[PDB]
A = this chain, B = another copy of it.
Amino acid sequence: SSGFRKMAFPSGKVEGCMVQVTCGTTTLNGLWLDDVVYCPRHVICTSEDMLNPNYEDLLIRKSNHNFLVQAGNVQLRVIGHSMQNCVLKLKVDTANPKTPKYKFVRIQPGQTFSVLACYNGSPSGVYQCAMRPNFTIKGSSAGSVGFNIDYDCVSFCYMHHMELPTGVHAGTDLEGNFYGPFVDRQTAQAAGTDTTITVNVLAWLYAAVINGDRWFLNRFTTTLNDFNLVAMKYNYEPLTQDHVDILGPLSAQTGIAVLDMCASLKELLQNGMNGRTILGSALLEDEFTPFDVVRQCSGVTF
């Protein structure tokens, strides 16, 4: 009933990659992999440029020595600079000896990852979050990154850029493509209406069963079409057949069919929890993926 918490990936492999990047009066975080430091391109903007920035214009103004990169207390020598989408790439004269095995991946809304929050290049905290269906992140500095680990391979999927007026965050993948209809400009922008990640709620109900929280199970089953009619009503994402399939493992480990569990969720949506809790929560949690549940309940290590 309590043995299931939001669990982040161990962050040590990423901590060894975080550096401080300064251009003028702007300081943010950079990601040092091989001989390149990745960071948001708006590091070349004052708070004044940010009103209507012309990024290629502001960047040709800059010599390599306009970028101060510090790895702990060592200054890194910048020997080239270029832009890819909304990411600046600073080539340095030294390859990071702590570079882990890594790749750059773009994730889908609903998928989860750990963010290593940093300030001035120093790792400050780590937390597990989901890419919302409206492509924002609910979280805590620009250039902090998000990642998953697979066994020894770090999959970098997110770099933080902007804070939105609702406090949610917007960012890019590591090739500088934004998640969501956002731009790196100080301007009027706002997240679209969010929705609940249905497949993740179901995964978390399975985690509840695995941990002995079973009061919401019932005799009934439903159909995809019938469930989605209810899902649309309560601002839940439609449940697709691919979603049913990835729940197969959990559906087997617990011996509870997905559409069987959908009947529980339908009932929970229509009638509430009636003063009860599930895994210590009065709300239906949607930031655990099916694999997140397996990873925590099976003790997968890295």
Contact = CB atoms under 8 A, between A and B. Distances in A.
Copies, count: 2
Given A283-B281, A283-B282, A299-B119, A125 B3 contact: no
Contacts of A13: 12
Interface string A121-162: 011111111000000001111000000000000000000000
Interface in A1-15: 1-13, 15
A300 interface: yes
B10 A167 contact: no
Range, interface on chain A: 35 or more
A123 B16 contact: no
A280 to B, nearest CB: 7
A140 B283 contact: no
B123 A302 contact: yes
Nearest to A122: B301
Contacts of A120: 301
A168 B2 contact: yes
A301 B139 contact: no
Given A168-B2, A283-B281, A123 B301 contact: yes
Interface residue SS majority, chain A:
loop
A295 interface: yes
A79 to B, nearest CB: 28
A286 B75 CA distance: 42
B299 A141 contact: yes
Nearest to A137: B2
A117 B124 CA distance: 19
A9 B122 CA distance: 12
Given A3-B138, A3-B140, A8 B123 contact: no
Contacts of A261: none
Given A11-B12, A125-B9, A140 B302 contact: no
Contacts of A139: 3, 5
A33 interface: no
A127 B282 contact: no
A69 interface: no
Nearest to A12: B12
Contact of A11 (B10, B117, B167): B10
A116 interface: yes
A154 B256 CA distance: 44
A11 to B, nearest CB: 5
15 contacts: A2-B166, A2-B167, A5-B127, A7-B127, A7-B140, A10-B11, A10-B116, A120-B301, A122-B302, A123-B301, A123-B302, A124-B296, A124-B299, A138-B280, A280-B283
Interface of A: 1-13, 15-16, 116-120, 122-129, 138-141, 166-168, 211-212, 277, 280-283, 295-296, 299-302
Please name the 5 residue pairs, one residue from A and one from B, whose CB atoms are nearest each other, closest first: A12-B12, A7-B125, A282-B282, A122-B301, A10-B123
